[PDB]
Amino acid sequence: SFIKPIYQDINSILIGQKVKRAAGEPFEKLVYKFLKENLSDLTFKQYEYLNDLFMKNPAIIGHEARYKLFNSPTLLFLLSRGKAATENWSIENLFEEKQNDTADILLVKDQFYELLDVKTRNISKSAQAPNIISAYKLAQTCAKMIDNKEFDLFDINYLEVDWELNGEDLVCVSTSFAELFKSEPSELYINWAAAMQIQFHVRDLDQGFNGTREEWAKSYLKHFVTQAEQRAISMIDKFVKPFKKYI
Amino acid sequence: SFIKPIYQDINSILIGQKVKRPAAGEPFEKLVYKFLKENLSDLTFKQYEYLNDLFMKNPAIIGHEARYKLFNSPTLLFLLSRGKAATENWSIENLFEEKQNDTADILLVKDQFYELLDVKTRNISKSAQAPNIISAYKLAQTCAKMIDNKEFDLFDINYLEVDWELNGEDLVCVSTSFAELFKSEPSELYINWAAAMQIQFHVRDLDQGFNGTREEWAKSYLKHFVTQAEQRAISMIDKFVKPFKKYIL
DNA sequence: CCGGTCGACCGG
DNA sequence: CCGGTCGACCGG
Ligand code: NA
Ligand code: NA
C-alpha cells in the first residue's frame, strides 16, 4: 500500500470534513483530491489510467494490440474496458466513469498496482455490512493469479469513511483502512443474494493472515467452492421446499 | 389502476421538462408524486407517509401487536410493515421515514383497494440491461400469502418508466412507459438470481396479455419461481464449482 | 439472448 | 452471527 504509509494524515484531513446534505459519495471525491495532492504521480481514477495508458501508445491501435499494453492477464481482467470500447477509444472519445468499474482510485508505482475502493458509512444507525467485491470476480482473479504466477503485481485495499448528519450537511467522524490480502480468506462472508458480494465493515476486518499470496488465493478458492455448494443446497430449503404445497 | 386513467396527464407534464443536474433521476419521481398529490390528493401517499397516518388515526393503539392489527390483512402487512422495534418505538414525535427498502415509491388507495406504484428512471443516453424490478423472493412470499389468506382483489403492483437524458446543465425527460405486473405472463418473468434475486424487464417492453385470474397468476408464478430456483441450484455448480475444482487439490 | 457489478442499507 | 432489498447499470 502506497496509502497506508500516510494513512494517519488522511484520517486527520477527512475527520471533520463536511459535504452538502450513493449518498455520501462526495467523500470519495475528497479522498481523491487528497490522494492527488500527496501522491500526484500515483493517483488515477480507473478510467484516467486507461486514458493515460492509451494516450502514450499512439502507434498501437485496435483492441487486440491495446489489450497487450497491460502486460498482465489478471490486471487486464480487473481494469480493462470492453472490446468495442477499447477499439473505439481515441483522443476525441476518452473513457469516462463506469458504474461497475472495479476500483475507485488506482495507485501505480514501479509497475505495482494498488486497487483502492472507498466505502462510505452512515453512523447514525447500525446497518448491515456493505458490498465489498464480487465473490465471483475475486474467484476469477485468484484463478488467473495462479495460472499466470502473478502473485506480486497488485493489492486490493479498502478505505472506510463514516459520516454523520449535522444540519444541512454530512460530517466525517471516523475512518479505517484494511487490506484484502491481509485478512483470513476462509472467513470472508459471501452474500450470494447481494450480487455474490463479499461483505464486511472495514473497521472489523482481521489483518493477521501470515502466508503467501499464492496460499491466500488457493485458500479463497476452496472457501468460494464450498459456500457455492452450501448455497446451492440451502436455496432448495428456503426457496423451494416452503413453496411446493402451492404446486 | 388509479393512475392509468390519467396516464396522459402525467406524461404531458413530464415530457420536455428540464431540471438542473445534480439517483440523478430522482427529480422526476418527485415530480410524479407532487402531481399525483395535487390531482388525486386523497389517494396519494408515500409508503411511509401512509404508515404514519394509519398510526396517527389510531392514537389509542400502542404496542406492536395491536398496531399490526391495523393493516387488516397479512399480505399487505408483509408488503408495507416496518418491523417490531420500529413499529413499537413509533410515536407522533418519532415518525416513520423513507427507507431504501420500502416496497413502493408511491401508494394510491381507494375503497380499500391498493395500488403499489414503483417508478423506474432510465438514462436514455445508454443502452443498458433490464433493471431490477422487484425481488422474485418477495413476490413469491406475496403470492403464498395471497393464497393462504384468499386476498386476490386487494392490491396491484404497477410500474412507471421515466426516460431521460442530460442536456447541457440540465436533465430532460424524453419519454415514458407504464405497465402492470399482474397483467404480464408470470411464467415469462426473468429472475436474475445474482442481481438480488430480482425480476428484470424494461417496463416499455413488458407484455400485458395475461387474461386469467389473479389466483391463477399467483399460483402460476409460484411454480415458475420454484423451477427457476431449482435450475439455478444446478447452474451454480456448473459455473461456480466445476471450473474452479481444479485449484483446490 | 443471457446475466454479472457497483453502491449501501437493519431486522432477527 | 446471518442475509435479503432497493437502485440502475451493457458486454460476452
Ligand atoms: Na466493490
Ligand atoms: Na422494487
Asked if residue A32 lies in contact with residue A10, where contact means CB atoms within 8 angstroms, the answer is: no
C-alpha cell, A122: 452512515
**What is the rounded CA–CA span in Å between residue B156 and residue B153?**
8
Cα B191 versus chain centre, distance: 15
Domains, in order of start, for chain B: 1-249 (3.40.600.10)
**What is the rounded CA–CA span in Å between residue A182 and residue A202?**
12
Resolution for this PDB entry, in angstroms = 2.6
Asked if residue A91 lies in contact with residue A55, where contact means CB atoms within 8 angstroms, the answer is: yes
Residue pointed to by grid coordinates 504521480: A41
Angle at alpha carbon of residue B221, lines to B220 and B224, rounded to 5°: 95
**Structure solved via:** X-ray
State the CB neighbour count (10 A cutoff) for residue A26.
14
| Out of B144, B223, B248, closest to residue A225 by CB | B248
Ligand with minimal distance to A196 CA: 1
Contact yes or no for B226 and A235 at CB 8 A: no
C-alpha cell, A48: 484516467
Query: Integer distance in angstroms from the first to the last C-alpha of chain A?
Result: 55
Whether the beta carbon of A117 falls within 7 A of nucleic chain C: the reply is yes
DSSP assignment letter at B108? E
Q: Is any Cβ of chain A less than 8 angstroms from the Cβ of B86?
A: no
**What is the rounded CA–CA span in Å between residue A81 and residue A103?**
13
Best CA proximity match to B179, nearest among B201, B196, B152, B155:
B201
Strand order in the sheet with B132-135: B132-135, B198-200, B190-192
Strand C nucleotides with an atom less than 7 Å from a protein beta carbon:
2-12
Strand (E) or helix (H) holding B47: helix B47-56
Handedness of CA B99, B183, B10, B110 (dihedral sign): negative
C-alpha cell, A78: 480487473
Whether the beta carbon of B81 falls within 7 A of nucleic chain D: the reply is no
Cross-strand partners of B171: B19, B166
